[PDB]
Structures are given as C-alpha cells and as structure tokens.
Amino acid sequence: APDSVDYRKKGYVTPVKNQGQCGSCWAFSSVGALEGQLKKKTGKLLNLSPQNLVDCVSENDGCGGGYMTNAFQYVQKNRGIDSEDAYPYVGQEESCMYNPTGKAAKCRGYREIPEGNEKALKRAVARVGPVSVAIDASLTSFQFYSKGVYYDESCNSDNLNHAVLAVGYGIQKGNKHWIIKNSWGENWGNKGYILMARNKNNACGIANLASFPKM
Amino acid sequence: AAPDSVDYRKKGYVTPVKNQGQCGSCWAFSSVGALEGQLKKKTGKLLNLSPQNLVDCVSENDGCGGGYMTNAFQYVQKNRGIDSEDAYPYVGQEESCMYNPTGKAAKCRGYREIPEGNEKALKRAVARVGPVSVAIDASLTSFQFYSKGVYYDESCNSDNLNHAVLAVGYGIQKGNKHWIIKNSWGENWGNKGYILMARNKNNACGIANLASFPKM
C-alpha cells in the first residue's frame, strides 16, 4: 500500500455535488464509490444517479436517510443503476422511475470494511478505489472546516450521521489524513473536500461503517 | 380476489411463539418465522430456524441492538443458508458468528416487498404466499398490555415503526377486520403470544409500511 494516494488525479472522481436539504448523503456516497469502480472497469468516468437510489432503494428512507450497503444491494438486485443524465437529481423523494435503457453501471455485491479498522480502509482506498464511509459530521468545526487536517475529540465515533467518500489519503506537514469528498456543494470546505485526520484512533468514526461495491 | 379470511396456523406453517427476552431481536424472530413458513410450504416440513444465527451474523443489522428483516433475508441469500434452531440455539445475547453450514436447514433466493402502505396488497400477499414479515408501532402501552380482541388505538403511529412481527393471516371478528399477528414476546403476552390488529383502518400502526417475505 502506497504512503499516499489520490484518485482525483487518476480521473476516478466526478465533480462535487450538492445534496441540498435532502438527507441523501448516503446516495451521493454510494454513487461516488460506484463511479470509481465503473471507471476502473470500463475506463469511463460519468455521473451516476443518486436520485435513482433515493427513489428506488426501498430498504432506505429517501430524504429521511439511509445506508450505503442497501444502495449497493439494490443496484445488484435491480441489475443496474441509471446515469445522472437519465435520472436527474431533484432533491426530494419521488416514485421509482428507473429506466433500463439509461443503465450505466452494474454491481455484483459489496464488501464491508471491518469496523474501526483504519488499516483496512487504507488498503481498500489504495487497491480498490474510492470507498463509501460514514462519519460524525455534527460538529460546528467540521461544518466550518476550511483547510488543514481536520481533527476534534468532540467527534463522536458512536454518533455516525453523515455519508461521504474517501477518494485518497496522505500526509500534509507530518499530519496523516483521509481525502474526503463531500456532497454539500463546491463551496463547502475546501472546494467541497475535507482532509480528515488519519490513524488518530478512528477519528469521527471514519472506519466504522465503510464499504464498497463489487463490479 | 383473495379469500375473506386466511389462517396459516391451520395449515401448519407456523412454529410456536418464542420469547426474544431482553435482546432487540424481534427482527430476527420475524425473519425466521417468514422463512419457516416458506420452508413448510415448499418442503412440507415445519421446523424452528435460528434467530441467533441472524443476530450473530447479520453484519448489516446491529445484533441485540436492533435491525431489519430485509437485511436478514439478504444475509441468508448471500450466506447460502440459515441454521436450524437446533444447530444454533437462541441465547438472548450477542455472540461471535458461529454459523455451521452442516446445520443449514433453509435457503433464500431473495425477498419481495409489499407495496408501502397498501393493506390490500398485504392481504393478497398473505393469501398467496403464507406468513409475511411486517413492522409495526408497538410502543403504545395499550399494545404492551394487550390481552384479546381486535386491537386498535387512534394514537398508534404509522411513521414510528419500532417492532417486528409476523402476519400469519387475517379475518374478521365481531365485525372488525383484522391481521393475525404472531409476536416474539412469549406465550404469556397477549392472546397466547398473538394479537389481532385492526385491518383496513387506514394502515393502523403502520402494519403495511414495511412488509416483506423471503423467496425460496
């Protein structure tokens, strides 16, 4: 495993999205991991549709929230997920409108990172690609993050409430970090990204509910 | 059109009422009951399946901390099997996964969901398939102290699903349509462990909001 990796440089990460008021971060996180695998398997980078997941993953609760594994299982059972161009984001739960003609990716299952294992999360980001992760995003400090390696001990690894995407990891000024892609728009944080402290005892519970799609 | 009333207990599709104890494992009892009914339907054999196997091994759920039935059906499918209660007994607390393939007694090819909120679709599913896993709002004190009769309470909350049970049938009693529900709180609870819950009373207690059954 390399000491640092960044999938944005390789072209495995789509532009930062804005979920709006909807509790759909889990759909943006799932799509980001699927997008990375799709690029890995076909050489194509394209936007996949979070709305498709919000409207059709009955295991989840639409804008009320959800888990990424349920999203990967749906794409697997459904035999596909639409591209964003074929099923645009609207920011509110609506009836399933999945369209097989707009199918842009498939999923053969999923793999979960063992709970709290930052070492395993790091190997996955390195050898598989971007990995869906859950963190505690409740603090005002995370919300007003702007630069540097974010860390707060008030972060509660037992209070997971937000889904994001680990697109890489590394070190900045001797400080280990995860490169995290958020879905709060290009203006939140650092152009929509946040560097989160790595190996500081699973800060913000970053390795507590991580998983990635199989393709 | 489906029959006016159905009771799979008369068909031998339902095992005795179990007691989950203090563990938040109602979802595992509801899942195993739905699997036990399809197993009886497809093979003619009725046997107890293991809730413990689900509690210890369904990583998508939280063990005794709670969970959902669809995650359990998805585990049995992905796992290629679920143990009998005899090969993996209920202990009422979270333990390490100790699934034994040699003790497998049922399998799952996935699951089907009932459309949300549709008590009509749920009635047709129960009649066509057998017992169906369902989730309800069991928080009311009237529910916890239920004894007999068709249960209905206007304050039951449809969006607050917090408990999993098993619909083994439906019918009518004293003019009130009902769902026949097997609970996992022991035989002393309710009516020998069962409760009749109001049917077609605008989805009372959210009975049709999260109903599913395993494919075999």
Ligand SMILES: *CC(=O)CNC(=O)[C@H](CC(C)C)N[C@@H](c1ccc(-c2ccc(S(C)(=O)=O)cc2)cc1)C(F)(F)F
């Ligand atoms: C971020 C965001 O926009 C909302 N946060 C979440 O969705 C968060 C992500 C996890 C990865 C920490 N999850 C919340 C959540 C999970 C699950 C549900 C839910 C699913 C299914 C149903 S059901 C069975 O009735 O259809 C009901 C609820 C809701 C929210 C959580 F966990 F609360 F943080």
Ligand SMILES: *CC(=O)CNC(=O)[C@H](CC(C)C)N[C@@H](c1ccc(-c2ccc(S(C)(=O)=O)cc2)cc1)C(F)(F)F
């Ligand atoms: C009945 C009983 O014994 C406890 N009630 C429940 O399990 C209830 C049944 C459903 C059908 C309403 N579900 C509760 C619940 C669901 C999900 C979790 C949970 C799942 C996964 C994780 S994770 C992300 O860490 O893997 C964490 C929690 C817990 C409880 C509910 F919804 F709260 F009523």
Ligand SMILES: [Ca+2]
């Ligand atoms: Ca819903």
Ligand SMILES: [Ca+2]
């Ligand atoms: Ca603080």
Ligand SMILES: [Ca+2]
């Ligand atoms: Ca788990």
Ligand SMILES: [Ca+2]
């Ligand atoms: Ca699931």
